[PDB]
Design a protein around this ligand. Structure first.
Ligand SMILES: [K+]
Ligand SMILES: [K+]
Ligand SMILES: [K+]
Ligand SMILES: [K+]
Lengths: 292, 292, 292, 292
């Protein structure tokens, strides 16, 4: 639910750019079959940026329905305005989602005090578990360990998706929070390392197209079988890297289509179709993982 | 008008975080009297992030009304979803604004091709002049000179607010575009250097509180009197730096309150009030500028 | 010998800037008593930059003598000219040192091919074990894992001191080299993490003044007792950080004097005496570690 | 002479890596005929790193002899140990050189106070004019404008080669120093911008192969004819960038060989021969410049 391999699931679209219900069902069945621990619905990989709040909510509710109690669903609820983050969060109160993934405000670059006040206010307007999400290369700001420790004192703030790729954060945060605060990687290429350092899992892009391997890798990691896990990680490493050869989720949506998991690889502008060079790059990474 | 000193104006708020018409009127009278070339309404400094589109529109319309033809108004119209950017632009058709300031999509990190398609689509569906806006430290992406060159060929894409603070961009862009394409600094601390290299003005935070000096400095720069302009810049430099000692627009709103230009220095979360240390830093910068 | 806690030992000086034999003896006895695994003589922390090759060699030979077979000694042998690195290395052939610590050429920024040719040539002129040393913030270049794997095929190239602070390097290098290739941290603040990821020890600055704790921490780490080790690491973390409050080895030399381990904290220009603020900072970190 | 186009001259070598007098003569005749203001002998581009002090001295003396009063010679005298820098400077007293180019200590990363004491001590023990040299990407340290300001008060510290490529440094330094303190670019790609902001010339790698164009460009810049200068800069820009496609001076020595200016393109390790891909890149840049 908040450990193991969690997929940051794509929002499959038809050629018109609207959610494709048949493709979403196919993906969710695949994750249930694959042993994926949970689904993050309309996070970064799910094109939260280009979906309006109504469309965002429709996708989450549809995912919840299709999941049909077979796998937990976490809604993406991040916003760079606190009032807006509260409003979006309130849409999913009493919905059936098990928690929220809420990113540090992007673009307006709040202070550490501002981040504290932002997340505290959000948590105070919901009973839903809150997972913080730090990704400075996308947001322009960096939620530091000290502020994480401060927020972890709030009752329903229960974990962090740490996507810096800076592995020193694991033990910097861990020593500042209680033993049941969840530490999740948001960086596929360093996620096994993250887990070896004491992390509890990964919210993953790679898991969209290698769900079984990812689930297997995180199981081995949790059991301390890191050498065995590294064999899988090595098989997956080219995808960990090349799924960002062009901006996420352009590569992973193409990979889904290629594996027959979705009907179309359509995205919304300003995301654009994958280049020819990108195709071959991603195809080779799929081949290396033994999926094509 | 798209040259000289252009103010990225604050959106002055009462204690409930709602637009204060009386303070806004005062600021606009101040800029008319101080020789400011134009007003950017609801840009980054105007808290575009924490205003909804209705409020955003209201502020712009109120700004136009109060300006009453005495000073040109440019609307912030940027969005990280192309469809949203387009529809926000439609709100201002035949409103009376002279142009739009439109930022590179933030948070979703489109490719150069994606940025091209984004701005081309926006420009397609309006007659309004478009000023591109690059600020990688806030957005997570960087509109490179090559792409600015491609976009400058679009009839109503007329200029760029370049806020990297990387001065090599001035002539990299200039050689790729026509002589009437406007190059504007979005980094106060390097804006005079920017103009000396060939830039045509600045979209300024400092101009909020040092409007006359900024107008004069920019005019001198345009006339090639860089030594004379630089004496003014030296007095203003502490302000250029310290107006970002805490997240913009926290320091500049406090400065406006201290000068009596606005009733309150209230912002919306996740912006928080200025620290005591910040007050002292900014106050010292204001005195260095001869404003207090 | 090439695992556990290895000290990058200071070169204690008299007020005239020459090696202080009594202080060096005191330090070496302290490391023998403390359980330090080995000494690195005239590395970065030993002021290799400001000692000429004759003085460098005198210090190494003196350290060897004073060690008197009680603790292994590794000579610093790095140089940014390959011929110069060979010459320096040859001075210690048949000396009694157990190996060499050789840094990537600094200042002239060689390619990965250049680094390969540099280290290969050096290794070919000695029977002594060679430990590569990567520290891009000091050298201006970065020896990447792929090139490390390539060099690890050379018989007497047996390990790396990895001082990037980038923990992803551990498993990137490990998968490219044989199981007996040694992986050592060159970054005190991340060294336990480094070991938890599969590293075999640390070449340490902190160990100069907390040798017993460091030796104890690395023992626990090697035995897999990481939680117990973290208690020590937490006690030492302020030293891990504050021993670089001013340029290394200015802080650690002052700390040695303060603990009575050396007679004077004298350095050679361009290193300068510790500031008053630096003193108090380092004193507080010593207090936190329970040493003062 | 410390203005205009100053060449950071290669040290041409035979196939054994020894200085080639005949090639050096050719280069010097070339620079006398091409209007180059001065020659920097055994700077970074002259492979200062892999020449010993005797060879270093020999090259400078040979350069002075060959120049035969027709062009001023500046000696590279930088070292990361103050004592070494001082004694290297003494080798050139009454040699006939007009000044020294002395880099910030590399690898040992002194503080600003350390840099101050370093250069002050060097300047104390000579009558020769001293040109400071800042290049953080190579040295690991950054001589900031404040410290340049302090150092400029020393009688015979007369200028700075600023190689950050950060153009804000021009006027940050200029406002802290006297009007006759010389500001020279050490970054070819931004050198014209640098001069347009107030800089007095460039110490150039490009000038090795494009001496006449560089002389003319710099003269135009000094006369304020930036548009005219910039036409030349545009032809040279590929060369400005691609002469660093592989580590300097690998590309520029190859270019010199290709033009017939030197007999061989041989370097000393850890510099290695140019790759085939590099040949093609540099050759295309030379043709763009109209040199082939
Ligand atoms: K909690
Ligand atoms: K245009
Ligand atoms: K080996
Ligand atoms: K002077």
């Amino acid at each position: 639910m908040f450990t193991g391999s969690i997929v940051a699931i794509v929002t499959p679209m038809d050629e018109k750019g609207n959610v494709c219900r048949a493709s979403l069902k196919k993906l969710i069945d695949y994750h249930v079959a694959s042993g994926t621990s949970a689904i993050v619905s309309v996070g970064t990989t799910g094109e939260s940026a280009t979906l309006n709040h109504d469309e965002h909510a429709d996708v989450v509710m549809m995912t919840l329905d299709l999941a049909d109690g077979r796998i937990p669903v976490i809604a993406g609820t991040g916003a760079n305005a606190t009032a807006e983050a509260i409003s979006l969060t309130q849409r999913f109160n009493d919905s059936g989602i098990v928690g929220c993934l809420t990113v540090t405000p992007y673009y307006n670059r709040p202070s550490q005090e501002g981040l504290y006040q932002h997340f505290k206010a959000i948590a105070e307007h919901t009973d839903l578990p809150q997972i913080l999400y730090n990704v400075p290369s996308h947001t322009g700001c960096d939620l530091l360990p000290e502020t994480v420790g401060r927020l972890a004192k709030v009752k329903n703030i229960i974990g962090i998706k740490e996507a810096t790729g800076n592995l020193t954060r694991v033990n910097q945060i861990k020593e500042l929070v209680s033993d049941d605060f969840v530490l999740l990687s948001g960086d596929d290429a360093s996620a096994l390392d993250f887990m070896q350092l004491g992390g509890h899992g990964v919210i993953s892009v790679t898991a969209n197209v290698a769900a079984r391997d990812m689930a297997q890798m995180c199981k081995l990691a949790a059991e301390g079988h890191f050498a065995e896990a590294r064999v899988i990680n090595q098989r997956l490493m080219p995808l960990h890297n090349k799924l960002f050869v062009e901006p996420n989720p352009i590569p992973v949506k193409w990979a889904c289509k290629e594996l027959g998991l979705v009907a179309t690889d359509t995205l919304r502008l300003p995301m654009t179709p994958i280049t020819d060079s990108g195709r071959e790059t991603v195809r080779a990474a799929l081949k290396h993982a033994g999926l094509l």
